[PDB]
Structure prediction request, 69 residues.
Amino acid sequence: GSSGSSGEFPAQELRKYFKMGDHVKVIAGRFEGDTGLIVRVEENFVILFSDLTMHELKVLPRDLQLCSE
Prediction:
């Protein structure tokens, strides 16, 4: 295919559970006010890739919140 945003995703699974590929924001924690995408998830915390610092932020799912959901 050519350059674009919409991809062959015939499966639209909308789940609150922060999953990889989904965007999440930071409401609390040491990064309150930061947002990014989910690159890694763990039973303890969730690692999201920041778009500002271009790094990997480690925060708990209790201080994060999805954007699309």
The first strand starts at residue 23 and ends at 26. The chain is about 0% helix and 35% strand.
